[PDB]
Amino acid sequence: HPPRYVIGYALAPKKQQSFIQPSLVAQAASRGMDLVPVDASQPLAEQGPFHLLIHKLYGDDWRAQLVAFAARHPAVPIVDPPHAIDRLHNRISMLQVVSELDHAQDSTFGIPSQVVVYDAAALADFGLLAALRFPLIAKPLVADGTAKSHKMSLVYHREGLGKLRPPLVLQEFVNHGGVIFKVYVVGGHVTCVKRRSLPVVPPAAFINQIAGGLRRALGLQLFNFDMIRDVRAGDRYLVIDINYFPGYAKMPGYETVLTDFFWEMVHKD
Amino acid sequence: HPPRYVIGYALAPKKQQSFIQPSLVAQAASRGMDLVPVDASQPLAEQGPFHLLIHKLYGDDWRAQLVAFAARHPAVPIVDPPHAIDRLHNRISMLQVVSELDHAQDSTFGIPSQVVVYDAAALADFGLLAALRFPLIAKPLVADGTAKSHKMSLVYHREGLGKLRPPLVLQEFVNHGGVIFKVYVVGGHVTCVKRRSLPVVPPAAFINQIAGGLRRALGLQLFNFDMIRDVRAGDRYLVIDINYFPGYAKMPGYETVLTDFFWEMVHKD
Ligand SMILES: [Cl-]
Ligand SMILES: [Cl-]
């Protein structure tokens, strides 16, 4: 009796293997939603009508197909738009966006200061590096997340630092008490994981406002953010990283969370 | 007998006053080129045919008119495209682009390392700031050049630093021997000014290759860059700033340089 919605999905085979699971496909179809793979080997405008597109692909060809799609079909949502995803690719611009949140709660929300190093010479000669407290978080300045060496790494000593490839961004990583909070966000829904960095949770209303703010600022429905407590004061939180469309299939109950999401998106008013 | 070219110009009144001078307009017309102001109070597609557009305006309305213009008239050059100008607005992304030049000359070309500070708290608490050698160069992280307080400033002491507005980018400014080189570029043409920062020139072939590289990397025909010698080694140069469409009317002979440019652009093959 009631009509059916197509969710097209354009994902790499490994993301497909991990995120598109029998349980997801079956729950979604049970509620009237058909997850349908997108032929990477064929144009998007040549592909069957969609009420919703989700993807995690990069590259000029894909972005092009999506811009075309967006022009041709303004009412069909894209999760997430390529321009919104680009906002994550420069670490310094990403954190620029997070700076623009209003904080106007009894918990405070800061961004950590960063050192940017652009060449081999600087990595050896820059005096300021010799007054940095290890361990350090290092990330290439522009990445995307695709290459394995576009990921955050710890550095325990100067010698480890000198073997990294510039341009990179460094952050002191010492005020956190050995605890990271990975926060997974799916539209208006938030979930939170204490993890022990170096291989006592924040107030839930606070985390919700932060997730709310990042979502409005980045224009992404699917991300996680890492945060730490500043254990100097013990009421101050710092966002240290944001990653697009993370590995939700590790969270139990993810199929229910993503199916409710998919359904919210295909009733977008 | 030979045909005439229209150069449309969209500039703020103060840039108009300084750059559009009787000598320019008269030299250009003498060579068959009509500089014609653009009605800011009317749409661009409603304005008379142009063989060339030069502008120094910012804002979503202008960028829109230009994107439209670019779609409708691909063969008409725009100096410079808005997306190319945006490449200058984040100091860290700007220097990212300059990092990507090949250097493959007996002179070396580096980028200085930068500290990025995002909030008031960090400006007071960040330990790394207390091991920085003054004087410092400070610039807001995103600017555009429009507001007067979107310009590079010197900082002589910690107390001066604590009164600046984050997010900002800091650079140690101590290795330069008190000498800045402002380098003005107009398409393939370069010119060079020794200036005494804190209120013995580089090889010309070196400066030309750098200007060449920045021009190809940024996709801007009209900029200047500031460079210093590293006076430790005395053969190593660092780009410390780039500014779109600078005050050429201060250089004597600028009318001849810009008229030859305008003419090169309206024979673009
Ligand atoms: Cl997954
Ligand atoms: Cl001028």
Side-chain angles (χ1 to χ4, degrees):
Chain A
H1 226 286
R4 288 182 86 75
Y5 299 101
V6 185
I7 322 315
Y9 71 83
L11 298 180
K14 242 152 286 172
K15 184 54 159 171
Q16 274 183 53
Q17 179 63 37
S18 85
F19 178 77
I20 303 294
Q21 302 204 36
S23 42
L24 186 51
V25 176
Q27 184 165 171
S30 112
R31 297 184 56 182
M33 286 180 290
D34 302 309
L35 287 164
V36 171
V38 169
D39 195 354
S41 99
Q42 239 180 114
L44 188 63
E46 234 60 62
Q47 305 203 50
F50 299 113
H51 298 79
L52 182 47
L53 221 68
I54 69 170
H55 79 86
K56 203 198 188 166
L57 305 164
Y58 304 104
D60 325 292
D61 175 36
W62 184 240
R63 176 198 305 270
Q65 310 187 46
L66 265 167
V67 160
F69 189 94
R72 166 126 186 69
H73 297 292
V76 174
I78 309 196
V79 188
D80 275 297
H83 71 259
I85 303 187
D86 289 337
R87 283 187 204 154
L88 292 199
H89 288 157
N90 188 278
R91 185 158 163 74
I92 300 296
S93 311
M94 184 195 84
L95 290 169
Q96 205 293 317
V97 163
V98 178
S99 78
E100 294 173 326
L101 298 193
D102 307 327
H103 317 122
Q105 174 77 49
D106 283 11
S107 303
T108 290
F109 170 70
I111 308 81
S113 319
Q114 317 274 327
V115 178
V116 180
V117 178
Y118 290 97
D119 46 52
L123 200 54
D125 282 29
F126 189 38
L128 202 68
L129 294 183
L132 264 178
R133 273 187 289 182
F134 291 74
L136 286 181
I137 287 286
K139 214 258 178 54
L141 172 50
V142 286
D144 79 346
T146 63
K148 70 208 78 204
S149 73
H150 289 349
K151 185 231 209 70
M152 276 201 328
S153 60
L154 284 155
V155 194
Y156 296 97
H157 39 90
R158 182 225 181 97
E159 268 201 6
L161 179 63
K163 293 130 56 119
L164 276 167
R165 213 203 316 282
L168 42 78
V169 201
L170 303 176
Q171 147 166 353
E172 283 180 334
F173 200 55
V174 291
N175 283 354
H176 56 260
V179 156
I180 322 223
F181 304 98
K182 205 173 276 292
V183 179
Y184 289 81
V185 177
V186 173
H189 180 283
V190 181
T191 124
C192 193
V193 175
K194 210 193 101 205
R195 146 181 84 165
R196 254 177 260 154
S197 82
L198 283 43
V200 52
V201 164
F206 175 58
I207 295 176
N208 267 256
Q209 313 171 56
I210 286 164
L214 292 186
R215 204 209 342 179
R216 278 172 264 101
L218 299 167
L220 297 189
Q221 303 278 10
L222 296 184
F223 54 102
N224 72 357
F225 53 101
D226 302 330
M227 45 164 42
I228 56 162
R229 202 174 11 106
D230 208 347
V231 313
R232 290 184 305 174
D235 48 283
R236 211 176 83 82
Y237 297 91
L238 299 159
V239 158
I240 73 147
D241 208 353
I242 311 175
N243 294 267
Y244 171 58
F245 204 147
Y248 299 112
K250 292 161 174 157
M251 310 300 91
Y254 89 95
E255 304 93 327
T256 305
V257 174
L258 273 122
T259 299
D260 299 332
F261 168 66
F262 286 159
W263 182 263
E264 229 69 300
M265 292 303 296
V266 298
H267 294 21
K268 205 61 162 156
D269 279 313
Chain B
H1 226 286
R4 288 182 86 75
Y5 299 101
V6 185
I7 322 315
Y9 71 83
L11 298 180
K14 242 152 286 172
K15 184 54 159 171
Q16 274 183 53
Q17 179 63 37
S18 85
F19 178 77
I20 303 294
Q21 302 204 36
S23 42
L24 186 51
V25 176
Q27 184 165 171
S30 112
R31 297 184 56 182
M33 286 180 290
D34 302 309
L35 287 164
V36 171
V38 169
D39 195 354
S41 99
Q42 239 180 114
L44 188 63
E46 234 60 62
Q47 305 203 50
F50 299 113
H51 298 79
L52 182 47
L53 221 68
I54 69 170
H55 79 86
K56 203 198 188 166
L57 305 164
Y58 304 104
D60 325 292
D61 175 36
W62 184 240
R63 176 198 305 270
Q65 310 187 46
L66 265 167
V67 160
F69 189 94
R72 166 126 186 69
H73 297 292
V76 174
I78 309 196
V79 188
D80 275 297
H83 71 259
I85 303 187
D86 289 337
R87 283 187 204 154
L88 292 199
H89 288 157
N90 188 278
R91 185 158 163 74
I92 300 296
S93 311
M94 184 195 84
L95 290 169
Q96 205 293 317
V97 163
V98 178
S99 78
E100 294 173 326
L101 298 193
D102 307 327
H103 317 122
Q105 174 77 49
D106 283 11
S107 303
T108 290
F109 170 70
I111 308 81
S113 319
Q114 317 274 327
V115 178
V116 180
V117 178
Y118 290 97
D119 46 52
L123 200 54
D125 282 29
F126 189 38
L128 202 68
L129 294 183
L132 264 178
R133 274 187 289 182
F134 291 74
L136 286 181
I137 287 286
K139 214 258 178 54
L141 172 50
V142 286
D144 79 346
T146 63
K148 70 208 78 204
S149 73
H150 289 349
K151 185 231 209 70
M152 276 201 328
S153 60
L154 284 155
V155 194
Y156 296 97
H157 39 90
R158 182 225 181 97
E159 268 201 6
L161 179 63
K163 293 130 56 119
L164 276 167
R165 213 203 316 282
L168 42 78
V169 201
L170 303 176
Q171 147 166 353
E172 283 180 334
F173 200 55
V174 291
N175 283 354
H176 56 260
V179 156
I180 322 223
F181 304 98
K182 205 173 276 292
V183 179
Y184 289 81
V185 177
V186 173
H189 180 283
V190 181
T191 124
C192 193
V193 175
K194 210 193 101 205
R195 146 181 84 165
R196 254 177 260 154
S197 82
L198 283 43
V200 52
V201 164
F206 175 59
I207 295 176
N208 267 256
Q209 313 171 56
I210 286 164
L214 292 186
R215 204 209 342 179
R216 278 172 264 101
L218 299 167
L220 297 189
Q221 303 278 10
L222 296 184
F223 54 102
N224 72 357
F225 53 101
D226 302 330
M227 45 164 42
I228 56 162
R229 202 174 11 106
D230 208 347
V231 313
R232 290 184 305 174
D235 48 283
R236 211 176 83 82
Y237 297 91
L238 299 159
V239 158
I240 73 147
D241 208 353
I242 311 175
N243 294 267
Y244 171 58
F245 204 147
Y248 299 112
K250 292 161 174 157
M251 310 300 91
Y254 89 95
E255 304 93 327
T256 305
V257 174
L258 273 122
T259 299
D260 299 332
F261 168 66
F262 286 159
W263 182 263
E264 229 69 300
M265 292 303 296
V266 298
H267 295 21
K268 205 61 162 156
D269 279 313

PDB file of all heavy atoms in Angstrom, chain A residues 77-95:
ATOM      1  N   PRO A  77      18.357  14.612  -1.345  1.00  0.00           N
ATOM      2  CA  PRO A  77      19.457  14.863  -0.444  1.00  0.00           C
ATOM      3  C   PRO A  77      20.711  14.060  -0.779  1.00  0.00           C
ATOM      4  O   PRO A  77      20.604  12.972  -1.236  1.00  0.00           O
ATOM      5  CB  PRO A  77      18.964  14.301   0.888  1.00  0.00           C
ATOM      6  CG  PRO A  77      17.486  14.301   0.759  1.00  0.00           C
ATOM      7  CD  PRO A  77      17.272  13.934  -0.681  1.00  0.00           C
ATOM      8  N   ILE A  78      21.867  14.652  -0.529  1.00  0.00           N
ATOM      9  CA  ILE A  78      23.148  13.934  -0.733  1.00  0.00           C
ATOM     10  C   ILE A  78      23.826  13.881   0.626  1.00  0.00           C
ATOM     11  O   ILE A  78      23.938  14.913   1.246  1.00  0.00           O
ATOM     12  CB  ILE A  78      24.009  14.633  -1.789  1.00  0.00           C
ATOM     13  CG1 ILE A  78      23.211  14.887  -3.062  1.00  0.00           C
ATOM     14  CG2 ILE A  78      25.247  13.819  -2.077  1.00  0.00           C
ATOM     15  CD1 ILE A  78      24.053  15.204  -4.251  1.00  0.00           C
ATOM     16  N   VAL A  79      24.194  12.693   1.081  1.00  0.00           N
ATOM     17  CA  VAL A  79      24.894  12.587   2.384  1.00  0.00           C
ATOM     18  C   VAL A  79      26.285  12.034   2.103  1.00  0.00           C
ATOM     19  O   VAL A  79      26.382  10.863   1.850  1.00  0.00           O
ATOM     20  CB  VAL A  79      24.114  11.665   3.331  1.00  0.00           C
ATOM     21  CG1 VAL A  79      24.674  11.677   4.734  1.00  0.00           C
ATOM     22  CG2 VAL A  79      22.641  12.007   3.342  1.00  0.00           C
ATOM     23  N   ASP A  80      27.311  12.877   2.166  1.00  0.00           N
ATOM     24  CA  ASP A  80      27.129  14.338   2.372  1.00  0.00           C
ATOM     25  C   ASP A  80      27.656  15.090   1.152  1.00  0.00           C
ATOM     26  O   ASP A  80      28.310  14.473   0.326  1.00  0.00           O
ATOM     27  CB  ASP A  80      27.776  14.818   3.666  1.00  0.00           C
ATOM     28  CG  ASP A  80      26.916  14.670   4.901  1.00  0.00           C
ATOM     29  OD1 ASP A  80      25.872  15.304   4.965  1.00  0.00           O
ATOM     30  OD2 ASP A  80      27.330  13.963   5.787  1.00  0.00           O
ATOM     31  N   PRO A  81      27.352  16.390   0.982  1.00  0.00           N
ATOM     32  CA  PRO A  81      27.796  17.144  -0.176  1.00  0.00           C
ATOM     33  C   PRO A  81      29.322  17.191  -0.232  1.00  0.00           C
ATOM     34  O   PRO A  81      29.929  17.330   0.768  1.00  0.00           O
ATOM     35  CB  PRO A  81      27.255  18.542   0.095  1.00  0.00           C
ATOM     36  CG  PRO A  81      26.083  18.296   0.970  1.00  0.00           C
ATOM     37  CD  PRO A  81      26.559  17.200   1.883  1.00  0.00           C
ATOM     38  N   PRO A  82      29.944  17.153  -1.418  1.00  0.00           N
ATOM     39  CA  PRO A  82      31.397  17.114  -1.519  1.00  0.00           C
ATOM     40  C   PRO A  82      32.091  18.338  -0.917  1.00  0.00           C
ATOM     41  O   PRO A  82      33.123  18.188  -0.356  1.00  0.00           O
ATOM     42  CB  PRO A  82      31.624  17.122  -3.027  1.00  0.00           C
ATOM     43  CG  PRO A  82      30.342  16.591  -3.583  1.00  0.00           C
ATOM     44  CD  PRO A  82      29.284  17.201  -2.704  1.00  0.00           C
ATOM     45  N   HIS A  83      31.494  19.509  -1.099  1.00  0.00           N
ATOM     46  CA  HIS A  83      32.039  20.797  -0.598  1.00  0.00           C
ATOM     47  C   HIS A  83      32.078  20.777   0.943  1.00  0.00           C
ATOM     48  O   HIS A  83      33.127  21.149   1.513  1.00  0.00           O
ATOM     49  CB  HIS A  83      31.280  21.972  -1.218  1.00  0.00           C
ATOM     50  CG  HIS A  83      29.893  22.145  -0.717  1.00  0.00           C
ATOM     51  ND1 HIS A  83      28.790  21.714  -1.445  1.00  0.00           N
ATOM     52  CD2 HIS A  83      29.421  22.697   0.424  1.00  0.00           C
ATOM     53  CE1 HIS A  83      27.693  22.005  -0.768  1.00  0.00           C
ATOM     54  NE2 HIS A  83      28.056  22.604   0.389  1.00  0.00           N
ATOM     55  N   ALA A  84      31.012  20.303   1.594  1.00  0.00           N
ATOM     56  CA  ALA A  84      30.957  20.030   3.048  1.00  0.00           C
ATOM     57  C   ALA A  84      32.057  19.037   3.459  1.00  0.00           C
ATOM     58  O   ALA A  84      32.619  19.156   4.568  1.00  0.00           O
ATOM     59  CB  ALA A  84      29.599  19.500   3.419  1.00  0.00           C
ATOM     60  N   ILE A  85      32.376  18.055   2.632  1.00  0.00           N
ATOM     61  CA  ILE A  85      33.383  17.040   3.047  1.00  0.00           C
ATOM     62  C   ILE A  85      34.782  17.643   2.948  1.00  0.00           C
ATOM     63  O   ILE A  85      35.644  17.223   3.705  1.00  0.00           O
ATOM     64  CB  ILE A  85      33.226  15.755   2.226  1.00  0.00           C
ATOM     65  CG1 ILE A  85      31.808  15.199   2.378  1.00  0.00           C
ATOM     66  CG2 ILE A  85      34.298  14.722   2.599  1.00  0.00           C
ATOM     67  CD1 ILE A  85      31.624  13.857   1.730  1.00  0.00           C
ATOM     68  N   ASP A  86      34.984  18.583   2.029  1.00  0.00           N
ATOM     69  CA  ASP A  86      36.280  19.268   1.768  1.00  0.00           C
ATOM     70  C   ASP A  86      36.680  20.089   3.002  1.00  0.00           C
ATOM     71  O   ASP A  86      37.889  20.171   3.320  1.00  0.00           O
ATOM     72  CB  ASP A  86      36.157  20.155   0.523  1.00  0.00           C
ATOM     73  CG  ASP A  86      36.058  19.408  -0.803  1.00  0.00           C
ATOM     74  OD1 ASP A  86      36.517  18.221  -0.888  1.00  0.00           O
ATOM     75  OD2 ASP A  86      35.531  20.026  -1.752  1.00  0.00           O
ATOM     76  N   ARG A  87      35.691  20.632   3.708  1.00  0.00           N
ATOM     77  CA  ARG A  87      35.867  21.354   4.985  1.00  0.00           C
ATOM     78  C   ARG A  87      36.676  20.565   6.028  1.00  0.00           C
ATOM     79  O   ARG A  87      36.984  21.190   7.052  1.00  0.00           O
ATOM     80  CB  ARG A  87      34.500  21.691   5.568  1.00  0.00           C
ATOM     81  CG  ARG A  87      33.854  22.867   4.866  1.00  0.00           C
ATOM     82  CD  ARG A  87      32.569  23.333   5.516  1.00  0.00           C
ATOM     83  NE  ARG A  87      31.827  24.009   4.457  1.00  0.00           N
ATOM     84  CZ  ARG A  87      30.512  24.170   4.377  1.00  0.00           C
ATOM     85  NH1 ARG A  87      29.708  23.716   5.322  1.00  0.00           N
ATOM     86  NH2 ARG A  87      30.002  24.792   3.329  1.00  0.00           N
ATOM     87  N   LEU A  88      37.000  19.286   5.807  1.00  0.00           N
ATOM     88  CA  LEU A  88      37.711  18.412   6.770  1.00  0.00           C
ATOM     89  C   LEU A  88      39.132  18.139   6.297  1.00  0.00           C
ATOM     90  O   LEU A  88      39.854  17.424   7.031  1.00  0.00           O
ATOM     91  CB  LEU A  88      37.024  17.047   6.898  1.00  0.00           C
ATOM     92  CG  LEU A  88      35.637  16.949   7.542  1.00  0.00           C
ATOM     93  CD1 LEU A  88      35.375  15.508   7.979  1.00  0.00           C
ATOM     94  CD2 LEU A  88      35.447  17.876   8.727  1.00  0.00           C
ATOM     95  N   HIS A  89      39.511  18.578   5.103  1.00  0.00           N
ATOM     96  CA  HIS A  89      40.701  18.014   4.410  1.00  0.00           C
ATOM     97  C   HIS A  89      41.967  18.775   4.821  1.00  0.00           C
ATOM     98  O   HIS A  89      43.025  18.117   4.911  1.00  0.00           O
ATOM     99  CB  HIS A  89      40.385  17.856   2.913  1.00  0.00           C
ATOM    100  CG  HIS A  89      39.424  16.720   2.678  1.00  0.00           C
ATOM    101  ND1 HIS A  89      38.618  16.618   1.548  1.00  0.00           N
ATOM    102  CD2 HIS A  89      39.108  15.650   3.455  1.00  0.00           C
ATOM    103  CE1 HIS A  89      37.884  15.525   1.635  1.00  0.00           C
ATOM    104  NE2 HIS A  89      38.171  14.912   2.794  1.00  0.00           N
ATOM    105  N   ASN A  90      41.837  20.078   5.085  1.00  0.00           N
ATOM    106  CA  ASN A  90      42.837  20.959   5.746  1.00  0.00           C
ATOM    107  C   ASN A  90      42.539  21.006   7.261  1.00  0.00           C
ATOM    108  O   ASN A  90      41.476  21.588   7.692  1.00  0.00           O
ATOM    109  CB  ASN A  90      42.836  22.343   5.087  1.00  0.00           C
ATOM    110  CG  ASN A  90      43.958  23.250   5.551  1.00  0.00           C
ATOM    111  OD1 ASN A  90      43.860  23.881   6.596  1.00  0.00           O
ATOM    112  ND2 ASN A  90      45.009  23.367   4.759  1.00  0.00           N
ATOM    113  N   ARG A  91      43.434  20.436   8.071  1.00  0.00           N
ATOM    114  CA  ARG A  91      43.238  20.359   9.545  1.00  0.00           C
ATOM    115  C   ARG A  91      42.976  21.753  10.118  1.00  0.00           C
ATOM    116  O   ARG A  91      42.122  21.894  10.993  1.00  0.00           O
ATOM    117  CB  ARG A  91      44.439  19.742  10.252  1.00  0.00           C
ATOM    118  CG  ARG A  91      44.208  19.552  11.743  1.00  0.00           C
ATOM    119  CD  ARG A  91      45.116  18.496  12.349  1.00  0.00           C
ATOM    120  NE  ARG A  91      45.199  18.551  13.800  1.00  0.00           N
ATOM    121  CZ  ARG A  91      44.257  18.159  14.646  1.00  0.00           C
ATOM    122  NH1 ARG A  91      43.110  17.682  14.210  1.00  0.00           N
ATOM    123  NH2 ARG A  91      44.459  18.256  15.946  1.00  0.00           N
ATOM    124  N   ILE A  92      43.669  22.758   9.598  1.00  0.00           N
ATOM    125  CA  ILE A  92      43.654  24.139  10.155  1.00  0.00           C
ATOM    126  C   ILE A  92      42.323  24.793   9.807  1.00  0.00           C
ATOM    127  O   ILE A  92      41.822  25.517  10.696  1.00  0.00           O
ATOM    128  CB  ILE A  92      44.876  24.955   9.684  1.00  0.00           C
ATOM    129  CG1 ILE A  92      46.176  24.277  10.124  1.00  0.00           C
ATOM    130  CG2 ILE A  92      44.803  26.390  10.190  1.00  0.00           C
ATOM    131  CD1 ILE A  92      46.339  24.206  11.617  1.00  0.00           C
ATOM    132  N   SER A  93      41.768  24.547   8.611  1.00  0.00           N
ATOM    133  CA  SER A  93      40.470  25.129   8.167  1.00  0.00           C
ATOM    134  C   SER A  93      39.346  24.427   8.920  1.00  0.00           C
ATOM    135  O   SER A  93      38.351  25.087   9.360  1.00  0.00           O
ATOM    136  CB  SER A  93      40.283  25.003   6.708  1.00  0.00           C
ATOM    137  OG  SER A  93      41.453  25.454   6.033  1.00  0.00           O
ATOM    138  N   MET A  94      39.528  23.128   9.107  1.00  0.00           N
ATOM    139  CA  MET A  94      38.522  22.313   9.804  1.00  0.00           C
ATOM    140  C   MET A  94      38.309  22.968  11.156  1.00  0.00           C
ATOM    141  O   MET A  94      37.182  23.424  11.412  1.00  0.00           O
ATOM    142  CB  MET A  94      39.034  20.886   9.926  1.00  0.00           C
ATOM    143  CG  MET A  94      38.069  19.932  10.532  1.00  0.00           C
ATOM    144  SD  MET A  94      38.995  18.458  11.001  1.00  0.00           S
ATOM    145  CE  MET A  94      39.607  19.027  12.593  1.00  0.00           C
ATOM    146  N   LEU A  95      39.394  23.111  11.930  1.00  0.00           N
ATOM    147  CA  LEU A  95      39.383  23.697  13.303  1.00  0.00           C
ATOM    148  C   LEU A  95      38.962  25.176  13.242  1.00  0.00           C
ATOM    149  O   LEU A  95      38.281  25.631  14.157  1.00  0.00           O
ATOM    150  CB  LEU A  95      40.763  23.509  13.933  1.00  0.00           C
ATOM    151  CG  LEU A  95      41.125  22.067  14.290  1.00  0.00           C
ATOM    152  CD1 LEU A  95      42.601  21.936  14.666  1.00  0.00           C
ATOM    153  CD2 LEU A  95      40.217  21.545  15.405  1.00  0.00           C
TER     154      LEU A  95
END
